[PDB]
Design a protein around this ligand. Structure first.
Ligand SMILES: [Mg+2]
Ligand SMILES: [Mg+2]
Ligand SMILES: [Mg+2]
Ligand SMILES: [Mg+2]
Ligand SMILES: [Mg+2]
Ligand SMILES: [Mg+2]
Ligand SMILES: [Mg+2]
Ligand SMILES: [Zn+2]
Ligand SMILES: [Zn+2]
Lengths: 169, 97, 43, 176, 162, 80, 38, 222, 191
RNA sequence: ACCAUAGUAGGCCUAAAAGCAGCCAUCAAUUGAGAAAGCGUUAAAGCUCAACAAAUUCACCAACAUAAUCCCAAAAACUAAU
């Protein structure tokens, strides 16, 4: 004869075990699994202040400045990147980086949809007012493995050879 | 970048990647170019010369690596994965070098 | 090798004899019969 | 070999700690570095401590780049208080105006740190104001006429606070 | 399908990718509304280790598994099909999906024991020397538990441990 | 090693920024010379999350700083 | 090797692998981190 | 590229003085001179007191019954104090000090001769009762992380829950009870005395509904 | 180990008192025989020399500044408590061995001779004799407790008396085991 | 996978406290990085995290040895079972 409460789990009577087994919980099982079922309609995303600011900045960049060069961003050292920034600001041309997730839709909606293959990997936008490509070509020639992908000079989409020809012009 | 940095790239002379950015199959080529142009690879050895040739009508991305075993590894990468190109390049340079 | 301490169905450590599907079905049938009985004993 | 950051007083150049072990581990002769420092800082005699970067090459040769002096010492000299507040935010260490912050920013714009960046002087002013916030020195927008009375009251307040702190430190030392 | 070809010509290595033609899906699925391939072809709760024609559709030529992000199956069916492929490989099905080793096929070993519905690996299960008594018995697992939801025409539950 | 100031010099100019040999202290130029960006900026109370405009980059910078603070607080139980 | 009932990584380079029907925390940088699930 | 999400901010919550757990005596200041019978009903059955949050946001919820003594109290106090930041967190108890005496035979080991001698005191705890309640300017993740050790070291099974977690688990239990498929349930059968099951059941089973057996509570028994 | 509650009797024997007596004896023996025989020529560090100050005993390193002039020369200095110089000199002169110092003012030169006398065997024998005397004292205490029990053996059951005797015997065995362990540790330290 | 630059050694005590025995502030530069969430130095230095740029399968807890003469019916995952 054991007490009402024990430590050995107090193995129950056979009738009580049968009662527990019969009264065991049975979850509701739907006829068709809803995971792979035609999904519910789209819960549309809401535009945030960050993406709105990115769109506004990209629009301002594409409106104000003239030279918009697209280059392949190369993972270089911080000191070299800052030195390149200083050398570019000596000629007064700046650089920017924008995420592809917001850059691609704006580019395909705008008139610069021809630059989509240029923005697959790492990207860098060289922004210059009153373009002077000679100094940019000279400063890019100093680094061998940093290639100019293309860009637009006053609504004129050009490749690397086009940029070289324009600088020589 | 870490795999190339830890493999000892001191035994390479020239690496050139010739590609056309306006094509539809240059993602892997540009990924390989960025991986081989990482700062760790640059600081591993300064005697190597890295060249990025940009074309418009070439339409055939390729990578040529000349190293001091008198060896020229040419990879015409138009459909290969960037990771596959990286691992094949690493396996070849470690085996011969 | 494996011994059951004490008597088989008395001690603190009893036989782990489980419940069977036949017993479950029998209990369900008896429950249904008693539910019908208690329904007929309502009005 | 590497790079070492050293904050050294303008008029002080000693072949000892903490400058001793750092150069001794690198193997660079301390006397040559001291002579170079004296030659490069003998054109300055106000004793303003400055940070510098020593680039030790593998061949035991060193290069020196001297930047602008310390912002904390700049703020201390501008405010007239020898040491900053122990508990920032709870007590006031000093009082300056926008003129001192602008002057410090325009004289520090030539340092090796902010020379590479091309931001205007506004960012440097913001950095100086943040450093003053950390130091505990209060800045005011316009108190040119009241700065004399503000100084004459804050000097008395600060000397009273210093006396109280000295008494508390003496009591703590006696109790310990 | 993409194939990597390596050419050696005078200390020169050429690595090229070649694209070959691949078979496509049948035009008429019974349930076009289903997102999942098996769930739309109505093979859910139908396949087993015996059904080799379905398991062989997506497996590497060396017997390897295929990524779900490429296949498109739901997670449960992906796990079930992985289990079925492992069971078939251990049982001896898919004879042509083994790597070709010219050096290792000459030294023959002991004949392969016939097996099926094997759950664990043959080289990882130690023999049960005790085997347990009637009340406490170490039952021998047969088949994968992920296949307990298959249709049972007889209606008897599948004995996963015997 | 140097010496500080005390008289009207502190209010009338800065006597610790003069860096070279000659004691040529710079004078305090009139208020008209200093542009507006010196006076428009806040000094004492730092901007809070609710004070800033959500359509401004400073708000998102502060939000990133708060995210880093939250991550640091959560990662205080590192067993590695 | 240390036989344990519960395995946990003692550093970021420990990897868990199922071998011989058991679980093994293997570490290369620190060989003392070899753990075997019993 | 990933979006930026706002972080929770805690300013209304104020840290009270002495946020650390207070010390607890091994024995009450007034010892129980009279030896009392060890009633097991103080452990058996669900808890009716200290089952809800009063001022904190996180709690240690006990899923079973047992006895807590000075060793467990000291372990919990030391662990929480050493793993808790007093500047941003505060903690409080929810169970009283050990007051129920436990007697050991001692002199002579043969059965009989009278009651034994009082050895130590314990605090009876039922399933579903909070043990330690914490709050402050902290997130639940670290609190759960450093309270899981205390929950494991407690004799009865325990979890580090919050207000949201407790509400979610209660609603899940209610939903499971609501949508249970089989028409036969322990509560219904016990109430209806079907099959004469009252002969093998217990009078307290009518209230336990099969979810409680001795000191053990099964949350998935509906 | 049969241990009674030690609270159900409380009147015919005080196990708490017996344990207190045993622990006091153990501690006194330990401290005395250690500090007496821990000399081993060089008693660890000579910084622990008891010098009288304010009618109390403090170590040399406590009331002194002790340095090492030479590996065999201890240099004491009287700066912390420069008022017991004579007492410190006397204590150094007679500290276990013949450590005669030189009174060079505040400085004190202490040569370290000997460390070759091989008197450790005699010290071990003395420690064994002291341990035996302590065992005899413990046996006397146990006999006093047994005599108290016998005096109480009037109405109290001899079953309870036997239980208490077993408890006292267990405590005595534990204490003598502790004494033997201390003797072994001291023997190892000496040799 | 992907990388890590700036005021600055933020201010006090300590021989030293440079993100790291301790206390108080926790600002501000680059689109993009916390007076620093883990290792490490006597103090540094240095190695990792989260921040941008590159993608975006799923990813919260849950696994635990043993006795003595010799293991213990054999076996079976689908022909229709209230
Ligand atoms: Mg009974
Ligand atoms: Mg029997
Ligand atoms: Mg039994
Ligand atoms: Mg437990
Ligand atoms: Mg910034
Ligand atoms: Mg990171
Ligand atoms: Mg063992
Ligand atoms: Zn599916
Ligand atoms: Zn490890």
């Amino acid at each position: 004869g054991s007490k009402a409460v024990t430590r050995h789990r107090r193995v129950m009577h056979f009738e009580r075990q049968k009662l527990m087994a019969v009264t065991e919980y049975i979850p509701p099982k739907p006829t068709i699994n809803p995971r792979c079922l035609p999904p519910p309609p789209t819960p549309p995303q809401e535009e945030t202040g960050l993406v709105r600011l990115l769109r506004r900045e990209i629009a301002a960049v594409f409106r104000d400045n003239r030279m918009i060069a697209v280059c392949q961003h190369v993972a270089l050292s911080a000191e070299d990147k800052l030195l390149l920034r200083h050398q570019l600001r000596k000629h007064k041309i700046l650089m920017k980086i924008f995420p592809n997730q917001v850059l691609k839709p704006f580019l395909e909606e705008s008139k610069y949809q021809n630059l989509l293959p240029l923005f697959v990997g790492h990207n860098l936008l060289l922004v210059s007012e009153e373009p002077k490509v000679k100094e940019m070509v000279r400063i890019l020639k100093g680094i061998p493995f940093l290639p100019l992908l293309g860009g637009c000079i006053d609504d004129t989409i050009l490749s690397r050879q086009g940029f070289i020809n324009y600088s020589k012009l | 970048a870490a795999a190339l940095a830890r493999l000892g790239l001191r035994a390479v002379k020239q690496v050139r990647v010739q590609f056309c950015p306006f094509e539809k199959n240059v993602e892997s080529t540009r990924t390989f170019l960025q991986a081989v142009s990482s700062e760790k690879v640059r600081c591993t050895n300064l005697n190597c010369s890295v060249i990025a040739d940009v074309r418009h009508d070439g339409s055939e991305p390729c990578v040529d690596v000349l190293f001091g075993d008198g060896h020229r590894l040419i990879m015409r990468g138009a459909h290969l994965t960037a990771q596959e190109m990286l691992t094949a390049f690493a396996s070849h340079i470690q085996a011969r070098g | 090798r494996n011994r059951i301490p004490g008597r088989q169905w008395i001690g603190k450590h009893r036989r782990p004899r489980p419940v069977s599907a036949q017993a479950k079905q029998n209990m369900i049938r008896r429950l249904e019969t008693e539910a019908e009985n208690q329904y007929w004993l309502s009005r | 070999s590497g790079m070492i950051r050293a904050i050294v007083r303008a008029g002080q150049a000693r072949p000892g700690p903490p400058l001793g072990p750092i150069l001794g581990q690198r193997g660079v002769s301390i006397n040559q570095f001291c002579k170079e420092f004296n030659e490069k800082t003998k054109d300055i005699k106000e004793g303003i401590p400055l940070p510098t970067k020593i680039f030790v090459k593998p061949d035991r040769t060193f290069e020196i780049k001297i930047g602008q002096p310390t912002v904390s010492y700049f703020l201390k000299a501008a405010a007239g208080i020898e040491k900053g507040a122990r508990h920032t935010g709870k007590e006031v260490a000093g009082l300056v105006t926008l003129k001192h912050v602008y002057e410090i920013a325009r004289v520090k714009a030539q340092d090796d740190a902010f020379a590479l960046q091309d931001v205007p002087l506004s960012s440097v002013v913001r950095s100086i104001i943040g450093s003053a916030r950390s130091l505990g020195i209060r800045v005011v927008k316009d108190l040119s006429s009241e700065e004399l009375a503000a100084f004459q009251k804050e000097r008395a307040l600060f000397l009273a606070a210093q006396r109280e702190a000295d008494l508390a430190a003496q009591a703590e030392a006696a109790k310990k | 399908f993409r194939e990597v070809v390596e050419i050696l010509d005078g200390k020169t290595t050429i690595i090229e990718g070649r694209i070959t033609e691949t078979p496509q899906e049948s035009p008429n699925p019974p349930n076009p509304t289903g997102q999942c391939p098996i769930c739309r072809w109505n093979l859910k709760h139908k396949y087993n280790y015996e059904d080799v024609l379905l398991l062989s559709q997506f497996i590497r030529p060396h017997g390897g598994m295929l990524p779900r992000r490429i296949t498109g199956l739901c997670q449960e069916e992906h796990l079930k099909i992985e289990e079925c492929v492992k069971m078939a490989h251990r049982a001896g099905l898919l004879p042509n999906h083994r790597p070709k080793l010219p050096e290792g096929f000459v030294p023959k070993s002991k004949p392969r024991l016939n097996r099926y519905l094997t759950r664990w690996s043959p080289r990882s299960v130690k023999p049960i020397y005790n085997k347990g008594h009637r009340w406490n018995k170490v039952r021998m697992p047969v088949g994968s538990p992920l296949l307990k939801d298959n249709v049972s025409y007889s209606g008897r539950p599948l004995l996963l441990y015997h | 090693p140097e010496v500080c100031t005390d008289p009207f010099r502190l209010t009338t100019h800065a006597m610790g920024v003069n860096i070279y040999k000659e004691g040529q202290d710079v004078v305090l130029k009139p208020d008209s010379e200093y542009p507006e960006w010196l006076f428009e900026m806040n000094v004492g109370p730092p901007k809070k999350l609710e004070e800033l405009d959500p359509e401004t980059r400073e708000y998102w910078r502060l939000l990133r700083k708060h995210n880093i603070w939250r991550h640091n607080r959560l990662s205080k139980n590192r067993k590695f | 090797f240390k036989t344990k009932g519960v395995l946990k990584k003692r550093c970021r380079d420990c990897y868990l692998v199922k071998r011989r029907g058991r679980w093994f925390i293997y570490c290369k940088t620190n060989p003392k981190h070899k753990q075997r699930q019993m | 590229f990933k979006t930026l999400l706002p972080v929770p901010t805690f300013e209304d919550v104020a840290i009270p003085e002495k946020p650390k757990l207070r010390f607890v005596e091994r024995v009450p200041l007034v010892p129980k001179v009279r030896r009392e019978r060890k009633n097991l009903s103080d452990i058996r059955g669900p808890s009716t007191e200290a089952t809800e949050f009063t001022e904190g946001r996180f709690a240690i919820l006990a899923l079973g019954g047992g006895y807590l003594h000075w060793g467990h109290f000291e372990m919990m106090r030391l662990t929480i104090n050493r793993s808790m930041d007093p500047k941003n967190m505060f903690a409080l108890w929810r169970v009283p000090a050990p007051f129920k005496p436990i007697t050991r035979k001692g002199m002579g080991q043969r059965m009989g001769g009278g009651k034994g001698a009082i050895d130590h005191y314990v605090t009876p705890v039922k399933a579903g009762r909070l043990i330690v309640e914490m709050g402050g300017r902290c997130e639940f993740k670290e609190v759960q992380g450093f309270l899981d050790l205390v929950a494991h070291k407690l004799p009865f099974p325990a979890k580090a829950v919050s207000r949201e977690t407790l509400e979610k688990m209660r609603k899940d239990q209610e939903e499971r009870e609501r949508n249970n498929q089989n028409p036969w349930t322990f509560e219904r059968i016990a109430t209806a005395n079907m099959l004469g099951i009252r002969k093998v059941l217990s009078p307290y089973d009518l209230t336990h509904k099969g979810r409680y057996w001795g000191k053990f509570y099964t949350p998935e028994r509906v | 180990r049969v241990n009674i509650n030690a609270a159900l009797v409380e009147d015919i024997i005080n196990l708490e008192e017996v344990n207190e007596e045993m622990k006091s004896v153990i501690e006194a023996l330990k401290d005395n025989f250690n500090k007496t025989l821990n000399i081993r020529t060089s008693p660890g560090s000579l910084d622990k020399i008891a010098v009288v100050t304010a009618d109390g005993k403090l170590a040399l390193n406590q009331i002194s500044q002790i340095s090492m002039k030479s590996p065999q020369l201890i240099l004491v200095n009287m700066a912390s408590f420069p008022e017991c110089t004579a007492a410190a000199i006397k204590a150094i002169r007679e500290s276990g061995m013949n450590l005669n110092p030189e009174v060079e003012g505040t400085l004190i030169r202490v040569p370290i001779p000997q460390v070759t006398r091989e008197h450790r065997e005699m010290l071990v024998k003395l420690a064994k004799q002291n341990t035996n005397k302590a065992k005899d004292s413990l046996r006397k205490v146990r006999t006093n407790s047994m005599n108290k029990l016998k005096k109480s053996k009037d109405t109290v059951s001899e079953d309870t008396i036997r239980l208490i005797e077993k408890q006292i015997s267990q405590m005595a065995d534990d204490t003598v085991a502790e004494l033997d362990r201390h003797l072994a540790v001291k023997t190892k330290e000496l040799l």
